[PDB]
């Protein structure tokens, strides 16, 4: 029936957690910034035709509470008929926003929709919103709650991914992200953040460490002594994974996603909706899938979600030019690659969250937009975007260059 097309996909640069450029910037301002960029690119756009704004946000509290999407609509002076809804599907929230938008468009009841996400982790730290799975003992016991870094280490252990293997992926992420930036790949899509006076706040991905070496990564201490892991959680994991004697703690600040601030926005609509606004479609949403796996290991959700979306679209791994999986932890990406036999040169080709960071609610939309660009640059046909999710969920999307 109706097809869903991507007309614009933009993002902010990503600000680091410690002494970050974006720390002084409210998350709402990040979104408004991007709305003004879309308006700049299409000054003659009839905004009355935009029926919804859908924003992923993992910690909808404080600066990020109170339906931040509606706040963006009003604060940006967008029409009062333009909607505004917040959603939270953990790490995949940004992509889930794009997917929901695509599905609304396909349903025929929405014409032109803005989708994306925002996470300002330096102002609203993860876990700020509370939650029963963690903070209610009865259900914490039930689901066998475990911080995701432990699941990441468990995967490394089971799959036989060594500390060197994991660090080698991290190095390659840094290298590929630096090459993308200096190749001018991100020029069109990364929108510098500016203050109320027009002064520059941030224009690049601060978290990047392009001069990373294998020796430096080997010096880092496991995150098993970091913040999230207090005590008990190894034994909980191993109670389920009872044939595994000992968890090898391989993940560190150097080979896990960076904690960062940022936002992303995507414009999605029907062919008809684009035609009368004079927008050129950049890509088409081919299919979407929600699936999952064991919530204890937590981070193996990408595999069945990917299998499901390929099946829906009637496609196989061989039909996909580019695979983009969020780099929450190196082992998650190596597990995915192993499972589906993904060739290296097809996987996260412009680097990922280890280099550039993972602003929870925005990431899905950011890496989605990253694929729209690479497809256009490479003149390739298909990309598959997927993310691992807390609670053992998986979401995947297939896009096609138009």
């Amino acid at each position: 029936s109706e097809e869903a097309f991507i007309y614009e996909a933009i993002r902010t640069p990503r600000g680091k957690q410690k002494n970050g450029s974006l720390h002084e910037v409210k998350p709402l301002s990040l979104v408004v910034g991007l709305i003004d960029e879309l308006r700049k690119r299409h000054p003659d756009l009839d905004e009355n035709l935009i029926s919804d704004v859908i924003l992923g946000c993992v910690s909808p509290v404080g600066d990020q509470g109170g339906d931040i999407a509606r706040a963006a609509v009003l604060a940006s002076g967008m029409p009062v008929t333009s909607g505004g809804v917040q959603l939270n599907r953990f790490c995949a929230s940004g992509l889930e926003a794009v997917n929901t938008a695509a599905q609304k468009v396909r349903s025929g009841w929405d014409d032109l929709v803005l989708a994306g996400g925002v996470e300002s982790m330096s102002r609203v730290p993860m876990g700020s919103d509370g939650g029963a799975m963690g903070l209610d003992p009865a259900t914490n016991y039930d689901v066998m709650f475990v911080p995701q870094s432990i699941g990441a280490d468990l995967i490394a252990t089971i799959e036989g991914f060594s500390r060197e293997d994991v660090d080698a992926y991290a190095l390659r992420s840094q290298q590929k992200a630096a090459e993308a930036w200096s190749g001018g790949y991100f020029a069109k899509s990364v929108v510098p953040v500016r203050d109320q006076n027009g002064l520059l706040i941030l224009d690049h991905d601060e978290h990047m460490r392009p001069d990373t070496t294998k020796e430096g990564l080997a010096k880092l201490k496991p995150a098993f002594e970091g913040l999230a892991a207090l005590g008990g959680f190894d034994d909980v994991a191993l109670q389920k994974y009872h044939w595994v004697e000992k968890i090898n703690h391989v993940h560190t600040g150097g080979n896990s996603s960076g904690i960062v601030d940022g936002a992303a926005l995507v414009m999605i609509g029907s062919a008809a909706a684009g035609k009368l606004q004079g927008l050129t479609p950049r890509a088409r949403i081919v299919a979407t899938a929600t699936s999952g796996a064991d919530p204890v290991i937590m981070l193996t959700g990408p595999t069945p979600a990917t299998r499901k979306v390929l099946d829906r679209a009637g496609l196989t791994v061989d039909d996909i030019d580019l695979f983009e999986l969020n780099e929450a932890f190196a082992s998650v990406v190596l597990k995915f690659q192993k499972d589906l036999n993904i060739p290296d040169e097809k996987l996260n080709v412009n680097g990922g969250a280890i280099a550039m960071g993972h602003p929870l609610g925005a990431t899905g939309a950011m890496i989605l937009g990253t694929m729209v660009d690479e497809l256009e640059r490479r003149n390739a046909r298909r990309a598959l975007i997927t993310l691992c999710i807390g609670g053992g969920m998986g979401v995947a999307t297939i896009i096609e260059r138009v």
Binding site: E24, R123, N197, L199
Partner: protein
Amino acid sequence: MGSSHHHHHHSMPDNTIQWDKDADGIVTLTMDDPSGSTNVMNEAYIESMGKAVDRLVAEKDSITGVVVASAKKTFFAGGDVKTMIQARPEDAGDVFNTVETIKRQLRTLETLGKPVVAAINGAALGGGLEIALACHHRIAADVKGSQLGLPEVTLGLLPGGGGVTRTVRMFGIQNAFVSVLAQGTRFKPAKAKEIGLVDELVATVEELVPAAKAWIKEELKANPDGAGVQPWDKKGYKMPGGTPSSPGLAAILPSFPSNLRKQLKGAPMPAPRAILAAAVEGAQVDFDTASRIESRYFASLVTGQVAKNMMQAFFFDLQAINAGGSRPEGIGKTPIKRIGVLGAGMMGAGIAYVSAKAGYEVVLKDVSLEAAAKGKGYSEKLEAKALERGRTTQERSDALLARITPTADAADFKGVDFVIEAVFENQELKHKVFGEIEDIVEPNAILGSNTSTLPITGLATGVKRQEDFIGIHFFSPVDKMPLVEIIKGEKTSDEALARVFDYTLAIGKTPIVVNDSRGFFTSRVIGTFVNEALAMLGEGVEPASIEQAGSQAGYPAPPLQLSDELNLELMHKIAVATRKGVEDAGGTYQPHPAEAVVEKMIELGRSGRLKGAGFYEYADGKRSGLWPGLRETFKSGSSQPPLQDMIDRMLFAEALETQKCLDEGVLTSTADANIGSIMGIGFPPWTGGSAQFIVGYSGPAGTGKAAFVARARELAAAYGDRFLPPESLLS
């Protein structure tokens, strides 16, 4: 370059700070700018403090404490207004950098690991008090004239040298905003201590540095671990009233912007809302981040038009007036012994009050003793409120009221050397009233009239000595209104001007000097304002909208409410006068569309508050909602123009009329036009005055004289030719 205390890091101003290190390792920094009578935050201060703070860091192993002092009569006068007014939007980067540099210096001072004590010898205002807030302890000399506060909001600015950030950490958001920031109030040293802005007081300036050094000595002995550490720089810090994420404050926080909007009445003054935004945003993050946010909001205001308007009016123009710009040149002083006031109505009563409060003997004469007494009762009621509010002692209040003597006998004007007449607007009555008195008063007495419209030249002919006859125009209510409009009639001497000018300062008011003309400056201009409002009512515009337009324009009171306070019968005969003037010269009068509305309300017996009925209904001495019959009478709702058009009609009418007054030589300076319009007839402070409005207009059309003219012409095309700009604004 990075984290530097200096403006420049590539390849010079004078030194303004004296360095003295005691045998005990205490450093006194004495501020003494050799280029003015006052210490300001100019390029020389910045470099001088840069050097000193570098030296503080370099010599830290031998410094035990610091004392910040001044060698002037005042402590520190704040930001350099001469530089700030010049800042354009493209200068936002430089302004941001300047203010970040200033604060980097203060932050080093504050986080030095040693006590720093501000020795406040005199006025510490704005940037001045911000230096003191960067210190760990504040001692002020309880001296005459000494003020402390952050008045930058009164100039359309904010405390961008840490003022916001620091007062919020000190008092919390709500108290910092309400008590200090939002209004920018000046405080006497005792009051400044009461609210925690200053820590302790000394009797004389000479005690300051010794007491400061004594404090450091004791602090290091009594509190070694926490010496030179601000409360907010400690691990256990808790912000008074809570942070925005704390439940108690979160519950009331949404009402702060609404309460301010209510207070501002929707006027376009950006400074108070910037201060609030900076306060809350600052409170959400660490000190340094909070401080940088403060700078962005500051640069926002400084490069905006309103700050320019307000800086011009409330610094430059006000200073110009206070230095005697409109006062005649080589004229001496003549101290006033006894004031005589003719008339015990609201005006005369008020004039008698403000004169008595200033310290003068007042003889208050009316036609009967009963009348004169009720006139004095006006002052008694003001003192009753002042005693209840605790703003005066009983003994001083008794003396104030004892200076006022009510009489009905003209012989009681014996020994009176200063006459202020405040009787009914009528020439022959005023002639008669002065007639009865001109021979009883001293031979050198000033003969002053509080006429609103009638030319002073005409009133003067009723007296023998016309050299001493002058217009002394007060505004209701006299106890609150700060302007005196002094009017020179043809026969008025320069000495008379000076003498009244002096009187005006002596009673704590602001003088403008105007050349004689029917309606003068103030009455003529306020007229055009209320006439625009009445015209809209006649055109069919909802009264509710008319009042809202007036308030959202920034006027202290809405125009129909004001039209009730001025009598409608006075407006009628003002129009009758102007009509007679034209018709006698054989011309044809063009009535303002408002005149039909005035006449209509008179015919309905609804001539204003004094008669119990105007555009509003009045019950039991209280105003109570618009008269419901207004809608049927004028077909209200049948005209629905843009609210901004209504606002602009009112503001533009006055701005245009002011230019005419400048053209005709009624006013002699823009300074007088601006301050006179602001203090006399409640023209909105954000505009910086009726004259400044012309050069500093901002809207859809843009900014400046050209953008004003465009909008003026746009209004003329839509509403009438009275909005066409006079030739003096064109090319």
